[PDB]
Ligand binder design. Structure first.
Ligand code: CRS
Ligand code: CRS
Ligand code: CRS
Ligand code: CRS
Ligand code: CRS
Ligand code: CRS
Ligand code: CL
Ligand code: CL
Ligand code: NA
Ligand code: NA
Ligand code: ZN
Ligand code: ZN
Lengths: 28, 21, 28, 21, 21, 28, 28, 28, 21, 28, 21, 21
């Protein structure tokens, strides 16, 4: 679903910032 | 998952932090 | 370090798109 | 890591795929 | 249009290559 | 339409990434 | 070149915004 | 609220570009 | 605010300029 | 300077996220 | 090129309109 | 300013928070 896809794009960026040197796990 | 959790209702920084390693 | 940070932002967006439903770990 | 691999010389989409789950 | 095709169901990167030069 | 505007923004990014040196037209 | 790649990404965004319904070509 | 959040992200990027050296307050 | 003004109907660049310093 | 301009684009996004309902002041 | 013109000194939005259709 | 502070050396979340209202 496109709304979820666009949301996920922002989520990745937010995780990038928030998680810093810890990094993150993106599972859709 | 993060989409289910954060795309229908909004996630705080703390909630986003859940997905950090 | 700032250049690396900027680059990483773009890398994680690229990974989001390339990896699709499989997702990815970002572990810096 | 990916940053040192890909932040000077451009990584192809195929190279980036190596980091997928 | 790309909007008709790709803003209402997700287009893969493969599909989007159709819009390259 | 803001939805189309936001979708387009992500589409152009995706095109930029996938199209490479070939480039692209965005002519909605 | 990663610098050109990153610059281009921002350029396409800017073009998308300024060009409006006219659209644009990115053909580096 | 998520849609608003996504939209705002794009708005502040647009403001960054339109406002240039003058900058802007984002006050939601 | 800008969100309520601009997140349903698209704001022109001129309208967005109204929010500059 | 273009490096500063690209940096500022990411800074705006980071402020957007970090500041939440407080909003922010972008002065270049 | 747009890269030569705009990746080495900042192009305004006005300048970038030159690359629109 | 924020560019001087955060574009030559990297800024933590706390440092970014300085620019919040
Ligand atoms: C930061 C962010 C982006 C997308 C969805 C959310 O709930 C939160
Ligand atoms: C697509 C992409 C972004 C950033 C660095 C790279 O090597 C490749
Ligand atoms: C990559 C992308 C962006 C926006 C819509 C889509 O279907 C696909
Ligand atoms: C440029 C822009 C982005 C998001 C909403 C708008 O009305 C306009
Ligand atoms: C808006 C923009 C992006 C990248 C380079 C520039 O000169 C201008
Ligand atoms: C988050 C971020 C972006 C750009 C520069 C910085 O120092 C920090
Ligand atoms: Cl969006
Ligand atoms: Cl960048
Ligand atoms: Na975790
Ligand atoms: Na402050
Ligand atoms: Zn978006
Ligand atoms: Zn960038």
């Amino acid at each position: 679903x496109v709304n979820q896809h666009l949301c996920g794009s922002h989520l990745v960026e937010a995780l990038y910032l928030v998680c810093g040197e810890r990094g993150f796990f993106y599972t859709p | 998952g993060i989409v289910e959790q954060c795309c229908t209702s909004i996630c705080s920084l703390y909630q986003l932090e859940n997905y950090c390693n």
